[PDB]
Amino acid sequence: GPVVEKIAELGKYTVGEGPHWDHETQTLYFVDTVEKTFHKYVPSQKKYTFCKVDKLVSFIIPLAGSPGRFVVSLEREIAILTWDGVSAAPTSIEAIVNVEPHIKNNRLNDGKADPLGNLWTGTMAIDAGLPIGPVTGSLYHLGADKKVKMHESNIAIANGLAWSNDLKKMYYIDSGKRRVDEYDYDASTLSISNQRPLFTFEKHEVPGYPDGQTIDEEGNLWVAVFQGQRIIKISTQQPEVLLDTVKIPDPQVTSVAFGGPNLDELYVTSAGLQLDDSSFDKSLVNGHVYRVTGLGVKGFAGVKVKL
Ligand SMILES: [Hg+2]
Ligand SMILES: [Hg+2]
Ligand SMILES: [Mg+2]
């Protein structure tokens, strides 16, 4: 039995999201995708800080080679933020590229570096809905030439990403599809192909929607279940295998990242935003951050964006 601990020091988030563990500094970064804020937590020293901007944000990833610089999303722009990690505002903002300059009602959502340091991220309608709503999103990667490439389209809610330990597969979540997809990934050309469902929620009586995900060193996926009050562990060796379920007190679990000095603590974000048609009463929906220990696996440190 794992132990789930609420991290009291951190408070409650409207939509806590995009956790990233920087192993060199033993620091957890994450966002609130509605409150327009970035967050830094240093567990060993019990230090917490935040930063404010005036656009919607969805990820924050340290830039390789440049301490104090971070690649972030600002609505539809991918930008570099220079930040001292403690002041309430960045020192400077440099825009890299607007991925969808003429689609005014879209925003970036989940994003992550692949193991080579390429940023992958997807867009969605700002007013996307569950279970049905506008489907306007696409999946991109950003090349070290600051030019974007599109890999998938017709995405409702661009969400969790992960890659296999051998760089042969990519895993991807469009929350609106209520499944986890797998793709063949060609690291040489950064092309994906052969889209196939890996895990379908309806086949296993799993409530809610897949949101963020990460992979452990045994190659298993850990998937946050928004409106399922849980994280699930699924196999990548064989389709449609549910390995384990860990209940999280917050119903709107949003994402996951391994961290801690041995990479065997799982940090879990959630959302306190109370939605129309929730399966959960308001008193339950808080938006805390959790630490899960005793899972018996390790994960990997967060990869920096090379850019
Ligand atoms: Hg910040
Ligand atoms: Hg910041
Ligand atoms: Mg998400």
| CATH 1.10.510.10 holds for 1-307 | no
Ligand number nearest to the C-alpha of 122: 3
Task: Please write down the long-range contacts of 141-146, taking CB distance under 8 Å and 24 or more positions apart.
Answer: 141/114, 141/190, 142/78, 142/96, 142/97, 142/118, 142/305, 142/307, 143/118, 143/190, 144/118, 144/306, 144/307, 146/96, 146/97, 146/307
Residues forming the annotated binding site for Mg(2+)? Answer: 17, 159, 211
Ligand number nearest to the C-alpha of 91: 2
Give 203 Cα–ligand 2 centroid separation in angstroms: 41
**What distance in Å separates the CA atoms of residue 52 and residue 117, rounded to the nearest whole number?**
26
Ligand number nearest to the C-alpha of 49: 1
What was the resolution (in A) of this experimentally determined structure? 1.6
> Is there a contact between 50 and 39 (Cβ–Cβ < 8 Å)?
yes
Experimental method: X-ray
Give 255 Cα–ligand 3 centroid separation in angstroms: 6
Residues forming the annotated binding site for substrate? Answer: 107, 109, 127
Report, as residue numbers or ranges, the catalytic residues: 211
**Sign of the C-alpha dihedral computed for residues 181, 241, 300 and 4 taken in this order:** positive
Tell me whether strands 148-155 and 47-52 are parallel, antiparallel or unpaired.
unpaired
> Is there a contact between 270 and 16 (Cβ–Cβ < 8 Å)?
yes
Residues forming the annotated binding site? Answer: 17, 107, 109, 127, 159, 211
